[PDB]
Curated annotation (Swiss-Prot), chain A:
The gene is 10. It comes from Salmonella phage P22. It is found in: Virion. Acts as a tail hub by assembling onto the head-to-tail adapter protein gp4, generating a channel that is sealed by the tail needle protein gp26. Together with gp4 and gp26, gp10 is required for stabilization of the condensed DNA within the capsid; perhaps by plugging the hole through which the DNA enters. Monomer (in solution). Hexamer; assembles as a hexamer onto the dodecamer formed by the head-to-tail adapter gp4. Interacts with the head-to-tail adapter protein gp4; each gp10 monomer contacts 2 head-to-tail adapter protein gp4. Interacts with the tail needle protein gp26. Interacts with the tail spike protein gp9; binds six tail spike trimers. Coiled coil: none annotated. This is Tail hub protein gp10.
Swiss-Prot record, chains B, E, F, G:
It is found in: Virion. The keyword Phosphoprotein does not apply. The gene is 4. Monomer; homododecamer upon binding to the portal ring. Interacts (via C-terminus) with the portal protein; this interaction participates in the head completion. Interacts with the Tail hub protein gp10. Interacts with the tail needle protein gp26. GO terms for molecular function: hydrolase activity. This is Head-to-tail adapter protein gp4. The keyword Lyase applies. GO terms for biological process: symbiont entry into host cell via disruption of host cell envelope; symbiont entry into host cell via disruption of host cell wall peptidoglycan; symbiont genome ejection through host cell envelope, short tail mechanism. GO terms for cellular component: virus tail. InterPro entries: Gp4_sf, Tail_accessory_Gp4. The N-terminus changes its conformation when transitioning from the preassembly state to the postassembly state.
From Swiss-Prot, chain C:
The insertion domain (I domain) plays an important role in the folding of the capsid protein by acting as an intramolecular chaperone. This is Major capsid protein. Belongs to the P22 phage major capsid protein family. Coiled coil: none annotated. Interacts (via N-terminus) with the capsid assembly scaffolding protein (via C-terminus); capsid proteins and scaffolding proteins form building blocks that assemble to form the procapsid. Interacts with the portal protein. Self-assembles to form an icosahedral capsid with a T=7 symmetry. Changing K54A: No effect on phage growth.
From Swiss-Prot, chain D:
It is found in: Virion. Belongs to the p22likevirus portal protein family. Signal peptide: none annotated. Forms the portal vertex of the capsid. This portal plays critical roles in head assembly, genome packaging, neck/tail attachment, and genome ejection. Procapsid assembly may initiate with a nucleation complex composed of portal and scaffolding proteins. The portal protein multimerizes as a single ring-shaped homododecamer arranged around a central channel. Switches upon genome packaging from an asymmetrical conformation in the procapsid (PC-portal) to a symmetrical ring in the mature capsid (MV-portal). This change of conformation may serve as a signal for headful packaging. Homododecamer. Interacts with the terminase large subunit; this interaction allows the packaging of viral DNA. Interacts (via C-terminus) with the head-to-tail adapter protein gp4; this interaction participates in the head completion. Interacts with the scaffolding protein; this interaction initiates procapsid assembly, thereby ensuring incorporation of only one portal ring per capsid. Interacts with the capsid protein. This is Portal protein. It comes from Salmonella phage P22.
Length: 59, 152, 54, 48, 152, 152, 152
């Protein structure tokens, strides 16, 4: 989102895999922040989701 | 070529700059994209100096056919890279940016390569002067002593 | 420039243009002898044309 | 070689002599030649 | 070209600087536009030194017309980029800003290109000195006793 | 030209410095404006070295006509940018400031461009010395009366 | 060679850059692959200036075929390294990266090796001028009246 209310385009990044214990969930290219930005990070599974250490590169 | 209109040239410039692409979760507004198209048109008009500059085949958009974006740029296959690298360099200051060293080098090299063939064609020798004879070796037979025919 | 005048007035708005050959007629021709001239020259050969011609 | 060869003339940038172009055409109406010194972007014209 | 008015040139300059446009949400302020139009008029009146300077086709505003903004600038297609890059450089100090190196380089290139054709046209050769014989090869001169060239 | 008074030049210089303009929420005292006008008058009188320096059409304000601001400066359309840029450079130290590199460069360029035409006008050639014969070519020009150049 | 396709070239370039490899657990993003292939096609068309540039045997994909990826590039076995090192250099700024000194050096070396054989082939000597005689030692020609070289 760029305004805190309205969210934009959604990209599907593969977040888990059966019996793969080393995955590196990552999205290479994100946009250019005009004034503001926030992220959504939505998940739909039947299995446990463990997420930590969200990091970005600003340059 | 996958790049075929001024819109695609602008999108490639933005992709190289890292501002926007088909992968980014955020994109630039259509007004910004239109301004970039205007920047490209101005740059190409400044280059092609009413016929006495760099000849590229660029086709200038008209005001009657409304969207300048979407018009085929008309460039050859070999000019696309140079044109959109130079466009990225030109429009980077709009986004408080600075086109990186590789982009600058590619733009310079591409502009050189664009003008190479035109420079080769424009390197021509003027005809002989007005007070130069054509010599006895030509002047015998047909008695021509001052013409220097421009046939070839 | 007025010293070169050969007519009295000038063409003024709707001035009629009369045609003097109103019917077909073979033409007799008179002149002063120093009016028509023929300027002639042999074509300079050994050039684009007359190439190989002797 | 004598006929078709550019003659010995100076090399100028257009900005160097912009405004004094009639001084270098070949007349003898002047005591010296003038060059443009400053630039509105670089501040000063490069010396070569 | 979509840039056809003094306000359009000012908008392009402000967008280059990073003061207006849609790459940032900032919008053009009327008090910051009038000042830039004043600066553009002064800059082009200085470049066009009463006709003895750079010729570009710019049309100068008259005191009768209320807004100088809104008029066509009158430039050709190949002058717009040079004019508004130099305008961005000129008006940068108002906002305590500083035109980026790319903008400065493009402004220099554009000004040089603007004067190139005028320089080619003004590079002219003087007539023969008044104290110079016409020579005995010039048959017509030997006929009507034109032994010496006129001069000036 | 929308800058028609000495106070208008002073205000343009202040806007270039960023101290005060039509858009700022704080302005400068009328005493400050009068001081800047006096500085402009001194700078113009120093330039125009009593007729042996830069000629710019400046009209000096007499004391009987009380306000100097409000008088038409008399500068041509092409001198305004140079004059107000140099004035900004001159009055920058009053506000513990220092004009930017762009302002200084435009000041230098404008001053040189101001003198250019006077330079061309004053690049004159001295007459022939009085110790120089006219030659026997100019016999029938002077009717064989004097054989030596006048001089002075 | 195991690098048979444009996608193989692109994957090698991304691995050189360290963006999507197996040494780092990253998969090639499908949005990155198309952008890199477009950059490869642009750079190849730029190099091969309609036959007057670097000849490499690369095959340009037409608009007819659906996948621009999957097609053999057609390079020789000794051009692969040069092509994909240059491609990594070109597409590094897409991700705000910078190819390291070894990659840049290998790109330079590879491009030079690409052009070496063509440079040798094009190092051709022009024939004798049309005004040069054959000499009397060329007995057959000077008997059959070929006293001068044709030229061109």
């Amino acid at each position: 989102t760029t305004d805190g209310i309205n969210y934009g385009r959604e990209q599907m990044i593969e977040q888990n895999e059966p019996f793969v214990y080393d995955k590196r969930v990552l999205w290479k290219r994100v946009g250019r922040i005009r004034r503001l930005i926030g992220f959504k990070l939505r998940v739909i599974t039947k299995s446990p989701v463990t997420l930590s250490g969200c990091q970005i590169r600003l340059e | 070529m996958q790049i075929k209109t001024k819109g695609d040239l602008v999108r490639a410039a933005l992709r190289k700059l890292g501002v926007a692409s088909d992968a980014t979760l955020t994109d630039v507004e259509p007004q910004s994209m239109q301004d970039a198209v205007d920047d490209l048109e101005a740059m190409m008009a400044e280059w092609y100096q009413d016929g006495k500059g760099i000849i590229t085949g660029y086709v200038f958009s008209d005001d009657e056919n409304p969207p300048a974006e979407g018009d085929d740029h008309g460039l050859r296959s070999s000019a696309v890279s140079a044109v959109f690298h130079n466009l990225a360099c030109r429009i980077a200051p709009d986004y408080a940016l600075e086109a990186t060293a590789k982009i600058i080098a590619t733009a310079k090299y591409g502009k050189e390569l664009l003008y190479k063939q035109t420079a080769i064609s424009r390197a021509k020798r003027a005809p002989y002067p007005s007070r130069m004879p054509t010599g006895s070796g030509n002047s015998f037979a047909n008695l021509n002593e001052w013409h220097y025919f421009p046939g070839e | 420039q007025r010293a070169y005048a050969n007519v009295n007035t000038s063409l003024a708005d709707a001035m009629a243009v009369n045609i003097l050959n109103v019917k077909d007629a073979r033409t007799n021709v008179f002149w002063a002898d120093d009016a028509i001239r023929i300027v002639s020259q042999p074509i300079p050969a050994n050039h684009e044309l007359f190439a190989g011609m002797k | 070689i004598v006929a078709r060869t550019p003659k010995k003339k100076p090399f100028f940038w257009p900005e160097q002599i912009a405004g004094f172009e009639h001084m270098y055409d070949g007349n003898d109406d002047y005591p010296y030649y003038l060059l443009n010194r400053t630039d509105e972007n670089s501040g000063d014209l490069p010396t070569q």
